[PDB]
Amino acid sequence: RTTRDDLINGNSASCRDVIFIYARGATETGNLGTLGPSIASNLESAFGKDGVWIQGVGGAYRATLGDNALPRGTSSAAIREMLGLFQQANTKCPDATLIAGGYSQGAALAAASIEDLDSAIRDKIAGTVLFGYTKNLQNRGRIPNYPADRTKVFCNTGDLVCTGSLIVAAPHLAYGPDARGPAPEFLIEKVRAVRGS
């Protein structure tokens, strides 16, 4: 299903070890959209249902297509919403390892949020995956203030948003295989690198 609010609904007395916060692309449904559920099922298989909390960015994030043209590639209200979720994870589950991801506008949102996040929380994000990263060229494939080794960008050849454009071509809608395999593989590897087991 396209809606997951595990962090908001979760009991602090029984925090998951891993918390995944994900932002969907433009016009997508629920708070996970088309790629989020595939990543979620694979994380659940690796850490178990009670070992990982899946949280989509909903609330003020309406994933409005036109917001791709704003300075940071998304709206201020959306950034405030995602920042709030990272802050809620940090207070509710101080010992949890965080992971994040975003697709299209959601990738710009993830990058903007992580850049603004206070360092103590940002440093808890073991890995971040970005699909069809709209600010790929502008940010030179990086998320500002965040290490390259913890970042994985999936940008298809021919996906114009990865080369500085806002045009949506067919390759931008072809990240399904990545969400099913390499993306969760990267996230799992980065969590295990710091948590062991």
**Strands of the sheet with 125-131, listed across from one edge:** 52-56, 18-23, 97-103, 125-131, 151-154
Expt. technique: X-ray
Question: Residues 38, 75, 172, 178: which is the catalytic one?
Answer: 172
- Give the experimental resolution in Å: 1.7
Show the beta-strand stretches assigned E in 37-173. 52-56, 97-103, 125-131, 151-154
Secondary structure element (H or E) that encloses residue 23, with its range: strand 18-23
Q: Which residues pair with 19 in a beta bridge?
A: 53, 98
Take residue 42 and report the two structure tokens written for it.
Answer: 């694979």
d(CA 160, CA 188): 29
Phi, psi of 161 (to 5 degrees): -65, -20
Domains recognised in the chain with CATH numbers: 1-197 (3.40.50.1820)
Pairing of strands 125-131, 52-56: unpaired
DSSP category for residue 67: G
Pairing of strands 151-154, 125-131: parallel
Secondary structure element (H or E) that encloses residue 22, with its range: strand 18-23
Q: Is 38 marked active-site?
A: no
DSSP category for residue 149: G
DSSP category for residue 29: S
Question: Residues 38, 104, 113, 178: which is the catalytic one?
Answer: 104
3 state SS of 89: helix
Residue with tokens 């916060």: 21
Q: Is 67 marked active-site?
A: no
Do residues 187 and 129 lie in contact, with contact meaning Cβ atoms separated by under 8 Å? yes
Number of CB atoms found within 10 A of residue 141's CB: 15
DSSP category for residue 125: E
3 state SS of 184: helix
d(CA 164, CA 50): 40
Q: Is 104 marked active-site?
A: yes
Do residues 58 and 47 lie in contact, with contact meaning Cβ atoms separated by under 8 Å? no
Q: How far, in Å, are 14, 91, 93, 127 from residue 62 at the CA level?
A: 30, 25, 26, 25
Question: Residues 67, 75, 159, 178: which is the catalytic one?
Answer: 159
